[PDB]
Amino acid sequence: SPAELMMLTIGDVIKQLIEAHEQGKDIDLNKVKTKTAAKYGLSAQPRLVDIIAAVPPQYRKVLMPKLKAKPIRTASGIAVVAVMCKPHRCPHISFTGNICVYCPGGPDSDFEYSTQSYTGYEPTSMRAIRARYDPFLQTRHRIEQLKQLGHSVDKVEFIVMGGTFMALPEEYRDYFIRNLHDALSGHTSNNIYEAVKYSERSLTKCIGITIETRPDYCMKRHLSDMLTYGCTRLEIGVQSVYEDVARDTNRGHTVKAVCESFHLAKDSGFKVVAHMMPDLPNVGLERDIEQFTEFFENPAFRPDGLKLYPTLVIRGTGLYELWKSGRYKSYSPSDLVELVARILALVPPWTRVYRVQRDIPMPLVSSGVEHGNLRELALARMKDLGIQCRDVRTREVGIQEIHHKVRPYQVELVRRDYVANGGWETFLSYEDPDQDILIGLLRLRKCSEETFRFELGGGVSIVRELHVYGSVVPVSSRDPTKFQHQGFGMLLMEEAERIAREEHGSGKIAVISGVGTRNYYRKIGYRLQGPYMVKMLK
Amino acid sequence: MVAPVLETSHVFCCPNRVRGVLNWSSGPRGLLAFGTSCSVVLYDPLKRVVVTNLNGHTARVNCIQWICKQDGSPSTELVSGGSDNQVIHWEIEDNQLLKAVHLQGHEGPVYAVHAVYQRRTSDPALCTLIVSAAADSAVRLWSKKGPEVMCLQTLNFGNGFALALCLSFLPNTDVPILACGNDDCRIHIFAQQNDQFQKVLSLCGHEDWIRGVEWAAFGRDLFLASCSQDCLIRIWKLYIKSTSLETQDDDNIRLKENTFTIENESVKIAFAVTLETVLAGHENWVNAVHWQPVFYKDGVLQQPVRLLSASMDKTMILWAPDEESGVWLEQVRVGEVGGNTLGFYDCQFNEDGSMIIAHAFHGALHLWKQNTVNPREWTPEIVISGHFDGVQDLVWDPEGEFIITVGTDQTTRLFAPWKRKDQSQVTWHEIARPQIHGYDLKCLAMINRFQFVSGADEKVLRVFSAPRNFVENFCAITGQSLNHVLCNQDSDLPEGATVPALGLSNKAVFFQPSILTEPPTEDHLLQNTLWPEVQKLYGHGYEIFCVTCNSSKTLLASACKAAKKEHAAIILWNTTSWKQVQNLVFHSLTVTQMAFSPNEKFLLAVSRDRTWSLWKKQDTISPEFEPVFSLFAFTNKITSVHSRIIWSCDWSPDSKYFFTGSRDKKVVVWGECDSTDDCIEHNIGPCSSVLDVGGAVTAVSVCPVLHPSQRYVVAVGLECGKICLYTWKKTDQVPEINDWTHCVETSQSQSHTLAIRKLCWKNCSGKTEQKEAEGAEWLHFASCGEDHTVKIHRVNKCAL
Ligand SMILES: CC(=O)SCCNC(=O)CCNC(=O)[C@H](O)C(C)(C)COP(=O)(O)OP(=O)(O)OC[C@H]1O[C@@H](n2cnc3c(N)ncnc32)[C@H](O)[C@@H]1OP(=O)(O)O
Ligand SMILES: C[C@H]1O[C@@H](n2cnc3c(N)ncnc32)[C@H](O)[C@@H]1O
Ligand code: MET
Ligand code: SF4
């Protein structure tokens, strides 16, 4: 039978690998796989996961740096776990009578047992459906998969998806957040504060949480509530900078509300990521370029991250009815690629693009995008036109290392200042100028005159993000072929503490952080106050 | 006769989801103890029945630990800790409660408890030493001399925590010693010289959190077993150092000894600690570790050397040492590897080691027994089971041989009795779990003997029917006849059910044919015991809240959450061809409960808006058509007497009066609803006097038995889980005094701990007159609440 032949082939492969390790010579895996499969008479080849899932323990520890699969999953310095909430209705269904004109799925739809703005056939959607929307099971399952691939899960970040999370009853939000923290740490708590304490003392660090919210649910109350949870990032859907579009699609709010929410969130200390949608109705091929030029040149709009979602028409929505009646037509594919190239050429060097298109399966789409690799096609077109993309994602060491083959040689220090949302922003970085390679970054902001938090009033400057890229280095370990634990963090904080005292004129510095970061900043010399890590500068 | 005799018959519950909540006593005929919600339940595995509940806690129970004697007699004292900042010391006599003492002074929920008896020759009243650890980064010590307690000491760990504790005495002396496992991946040892505890030693080696330590005494040496989340188990060894002489064998390689010195009666004694071994074999976390207790065979004490461990990767391992070499070897590895189900929290031995028990992630209990002749074979056995979250509704078999419950744990369970030839007592066990749903369940109703309707946190009602193997299993276990239970009326029907590939539904498998003569275990219940779905009803705009059915088995009601008038509307269905019949628009808030009069000519509704309404059915012959309903009486703000939300209502057995209970701590009777022939408009109004029960009323029920003396007994439940039986009597005079009489009340161990959500008498309409009964000395009913518990109570007839 093929099964025992497969097993013997696998065992022989690990035997050769461990022998070669013992006498200490390098070995090529593909040739060994083919040769060993030839002997036992097979019609297939071994899979990497199978070879990983049969190593003895000590050898399992020693020889993972050769059998790892999908090296992109931890090429940015963290491990990402995505979880989903319970199905529910969007808050503006009541006082308007209906929801956005293009959103698919939801509690009242033909997509059975699916969350709003999702179909249920997606990877994460099918993971939570079989788990019946339980945060503990989802976290455990995803961490098990990540460990089975062969990655290190020392540092974790959560992403909470679904509809509007902050519109649910308080008890459910308590349940969800405390279960996430307990799943990481291993405790069995009763409320948020107990879970937060135990997670602070944990060994599997929780770097931060990300939540998606609407501009009318981002006020002082909601911001404070999210501050107690441990959240550090926000996702808001702007979709357009034009006031007529925001009311012809039954969005439910206005652009001025979006700007005010941006101002409050940035003064409180969060990070802002914006969803934008090209090819909206009543928006031609010339208003998109102006839209994005204003987006990146007007101080009221400048965000920290972007998500480009070209418009898709899906069955069971108002836009579907518009499309059937012969009143709405999509762009041609060449025009779409050209537009995306032009848009990507405008992104400033301090902005990071996380995703470039949706992930709806192709057969469910009636019109719109049909391919599945828009980003790389756009990059090739940009190379043809002679322009270049200079965002954050396509300039860091891991991406430059796996897509191209380059390494930093002549690292230098760079600083960029600007004005945004009524505040004076600075962006410090360590990067290689000649090859255009990014290593580590830090964001700093001087608090404006309209801050409401008690801890930040009276002359406080706040640090909003500190990050060093590369592959993941486990805590208290060192790897001379990677970039993390080599002192680029205490160099970036010493400079932030000099700007905040000699230029801002402040007398205190505050940091928003997770929990493992709490221990790190305690090591540096900061103390704890409220949900912040503060330090006197006098 | 002068006083009624209320007694409890059966209790169904499961342990909490905490580490160290289960503990098995030592000595012959010991008792198992675990914690459910706010109660400590004592369970007797040999008879497979629950003996009693100890309830004085106001929050979730976290730890339980028996106190071990020296003679080998069964223990009679134990200590518990709660998530209400307090510890409690209990005393037991004759399988009852004798006394309880509260120890207070913590500032967070407690999470670790231990206690021992003290040895001394002053003939004291059994002095006891207690140690506790909580979430306020502190460890506290207590002493209990008789009925008096006092706090000896407190220890502060900065911003750390203590996760495990154990107490014992140093060898060849009477100095207590303490071992504490911390989040620092480091064990701390304390010794009590003079009158206080002082740190002596710190042991390193682990590199993750520690989740259990245990002392053991072997000969003249002391052993310590430690487990962690490193997936590793370590054994240490403490002994008395030499006499500072006779040490001349320097031609050997030995580990460095960790030494300390203590003062005892003006004498210096030196002790040494050294590591013994490091076991391995687990993949996920190790949650608990335990030695084997000593026991007495024919007078002589036997002291085996064995170890037990339970892990998060669905496994248990038993370890024993090897005498040929210096290593330990696995002997038995028990569990079920595979499936999305997670692992175990706790594991326990028996008195002698014949049986082994384990506690699962959801709350299921697993029990294994060893064969007498084959010593490496273990088989599972029958254990208690129940919901792991709040129960919301309850129904009875129309003929009275099983009950069906739903809860916010997204499950539906069925309980039925077991009949065995070679015994007289009857015990009730779970045999069916006909739903594992994706929404929280709220309501249930019964249509036929093997068909029901369920309503959950969604806009859809569902209908479930029973497969074939269920009937065979039911008639086998309950002891009936297969031909007679079918009554030649069910005929051909599907065989089973299975989970669908996508979405939430049930699909007939016309699972596996598995005949059963004994109740199943918690691996056949999870998979092979579902029920097919045969209908699905739409027509509501929001999540369901209430369901009822008439006695003629052809109609059905419904309600949903609402904030306006166009959403709060009752809907009537059919039971032969499910379509909407008519919509009854009234009220502006949610309808909480409805009831059909036994005369099948009325329908009543109570709502959050402090009002109510009565709907009368008009009379037509029209055999092919269906009758209709319309308003017969109502109530506005002024006519309403309840000042707050109405929670329950019920009918009199003769369709004459009806009772309402609300949060206003009052139960009112509205009467003269009879004379349906021709009234001018109505005469409905208050027909009694209000009663101040003492707290919010959340359940009302009336016994379906008529007495010539015209007794109307009402079972009233409260938020605090009390059940009071009153006796209402119509005055028939213009004074309304002497209509409320208190008959009987539940005791402190027979009551619940949180709100009561349902009460239902046994309306055995199939047995209209009790043919085979002891003169019907007793009346049975059942209760459920938000304390994870379902209970069955029995009351004396002639007393009421
Ligand atoms: C605060 C926030 O918003 S999040 C910080 C970013 N989140 C991430 O962890 C992603 C990647 N982060 C990193 O690269 C690092 O964790 C940073 C940014 C915190 C520090 O970057 P580095 O340049 O690696 O720090 P640096 O080399 O100066 O310091 C190394 C020391 O920090 C320790 N350390 C690193 N991360 C942590 C942590 N989460 N908790 C505790 N100690 C930590 C290392 O163990 C090492 O200590 P040691 O070598 O003396 O034993
Ligand atoms: C989750 C995110 O998906 C985007 N989104 C919602 N509907 C559509 C659609 N039909 N096509 C493309 N993107 C869409 C919105 O930007 C929303 O914020
Ligand atoms: C999941 S959609 C994006 C978040 C939110 N519903 C918004 O429209 O802004
Ligand atoms: S708010 Fe977001 S999720 Fe809700 S309907 Fe609009 S686009 Fe969809």
Residue A305 · residue A441 · CB < 8 Å: no
Choose among A471, A491, A496, A492: nearest CA to A481: A471
Choose among B320, B319, B334, B330: nearest CA to B378: B334
Does any CB of chain B come closer than 8 Å to the CB of residue A133? yes
A353 strand-pairing partners = A306
* Strands across the sheet containing B210-218: B210-218, B221-228, B233-240, B268-279, B258-263
Which residues 706-735 of B have a C-beta within 8 angstroms of A?
none
Q: Which of B83, B285, B504 sits opposite A190 (nearest CB)?
A: B83
Best residue in B211, B337, B439 for a mutation probing chain A (most A CBs within 10 Å): B439
Q: Identify the residue whose tokens are 């207070």.
A: B104
* Strands across the sheet containing B138-145: B110-117, B128-134, B138-145, B148-156
Does any CB of chain A come closer than 8 Å to the CB of residue B60? yes
Transcribe A316-377 into DSSP letters.
Answer: SSHHHHHHHTT---PPPHHHHHHHHHHHHTT--TT-EEEESS----GGGEEES---S-HHHH
* Strands across the sheet containing B411-418: B391-396, B403-407, B411-418, B427-432
Nearest CA in chain A to B287: A186
- For ligand 4, what atom is nearest to the CA of residue A92? 1
Does any CB of chain A come closer than 8 Å to the CB of residue B19? yes
The ligand with the least distance to the CA atom of A440 is 1
Q: Is A488 annotated as a binding residue?
A: yes
CA B328 to CA B288: how far, in whole Å? Answer: 18
A497-A501-A502-A505 Cα dihedral, nearest 10 degrees: 150
Does any CB of chain B come closer than 8 Å to the CB of residue A186? yes
Resolution of the PDB structure in angstroms? 2.9
B199 strand-pairing partners = B190
Residue B402 · residue B416 · CB < 8 Å: yes
- A203 CB neighbours in chain B (<8 A) are 208-209
Residue A389 · residue A345 · CB < 8 Å: yes
Q: Is the CB of A236 under 6 A from ligand 3?
A: yes
Amino acid in the structure at residue B773: A
Q: What share of chain A is helix, strand, coil (3-state, %, to 5)?
A: 40, 20, 40
The number of angstroms, rounded, from the C-alpha of A120 to the middle of its chain's C-alpha atoms is 21
Three-state DSSP class for residue B574 = coil
- C-alpha neighbours within 13 Å on the C-beta side of residue A41: 3
The ligand with the least distance to the CA atom of A532 is 1
The ligand with the least distance to the CA atom of A100 is 4
CA B363 to CA A273: how far, in whole Å? Answer: 42
Q: Cβ B438–A201 below 8 Å, yes or no? A: no
Q: Cβ A201–B285 below 8 Å, yes or no? A: no
The radius of gyration of chain A from alpha carbons, rounded to an integer in Å, stands at 25
**In Å, how far are B42, B364, B748 from B54, measured between CA atoms?**
8, 21, 9
Q: Cβ B209–A112 below 8 Å, yes or no? A: no
Q: Which of B160, B161, B229 sits opposite A186 (nearest CB)?
A: B229
- B503 CB neighbours in chain A (<8 A) are 112-113
A241 strand-pairing partners = none
Q: Which of A112, A141, A188 sits opposite B503 (nearest CB)?
A: A112
Residue A116 · residue A105 · CB < 8 Å: yes
Shortest alpha-carbon distance between residue B458 and chain A (Å): 9
Q: Is the CB of A237 under 6 A from ligand 3?
A: yes
- C-alpha neighbours within 13 Å on the C-beta side of residue B285: 22
- The alpha carbon of B405 and the centre of ligand 3 are apart by a number of angstroms equal to 39
The radius of gyration of chain B from alpha carbons, rounded to an integer in Å, stands at 31
- The alpha carbon of A378 and the centre of ligand 4 are apart by a number of angstroms equal to 28
Q: Which of A132, A201, A203 sits opposite B161 (nearest CB)?
A: A201
Q: Identify the residue whose tokens are 């208190």.
A: B742
Transcribe B270-306 into DSSP letters.
Answer: EEEEEEEEEE---SS-EEEEE----EEETTEEE----
Tell me the torsion sign for CA atoms B255, B258, B261, B262. negative
- Residue A275 structure tokens: 């969803």
Nearest CA in chain A to B208: A203
Q: Is A441 annotated as a binding residue?
A: no
Shortest alpha-carbon distance between residue A14 and chain B (Å): 20
CA B317 to CA B311: how far, in whole Å? Answer: 9
Q: Is A218 annotated as a binding residue?
A: no
- Residue with CA at minimum distance from ligand 3 atom 1: A163
Per-residue H/E/C for A128-181: HHHCCCCHHHHHHHHHHHHHHHCCCCCEEEEEEECCCHHHCCHHHHHHHHHHHH
- Would you tell me the crossing angle of helices A220-229 and A255-268 to the nearest 10 degrees? 40
Q: What angle do CA A268, A270, A276 make, to 5 degrees?
A: 125
The number of angstroms, rounded, from the C-alpha of A51 to the middle of its chain's C-alpha atoms is 30
Which residues 78-117 of A have a C-beta within 8 angstroms of B?
112-113
Q: Cβ A112–B502 below 8 Å, yes or no? A: yes
CA A533 to CA A538: how far, in whole Å? Answer: 16
Best residue in B57, B85, B106, B183 for a mutation probing chain A (most A CBs within 10 Å): B183
Q: Is the CB of A520 under 6 A from ligand 1?
A: yes
Q: Cβ B342–A132 below 8 Å, yes or no? A: no
Q: Is the CB of A308 under 6 A from ligand 4?
A: no
**In Å, how far are A395, B293, B630, B659 from B656, measured between CA atoms?**
83, 64, 19, 11
Residue A424 · residue A416 · CB < 8 Å: no
Q: Is A489 annotated as a binding residue?
A: yes
Does any CB of chain B come closer than 8 Å to the CB of residue A58? no
Q: Identify the residue whose tokens are 């540096």.
A: A524
Residue B385 · residue B430 · CB < 8 Å: yes
According to DSSP, residue A125 is labeled H
Choose among A227, A84, A275: nearest CA to A162: A84
Does any CB of chain A come closer than 8 Å to the CB of residue B285? yes
- B342 CB neighbours in chain A (<8 A) are 137, 140
Q: Is the CB of A161 under 6 A from ligand 4?
A: no
CA A27 to CA B77: how far, in whole Å? Answer: 66
A378: phi then psi, degrees, rounded to nearest 5: -65, -40
Does any CB of chain B come closer than 8 Å to the CB of residue A190? yes
Q: Terminus-to-terminus CA distance in chain B, angstroms?
A: 9
- Residue B727 structure tokens: 């006796």
- A141 CB neighbours in chain B (<8 A) are 340
Transcribe B471-498 into DSSP letters.
Answer: HHHHHHHHT--HHHHHTTTS-S----EE
Q: Is the CB of A90 under 6 A from ligand 4?
A: yes
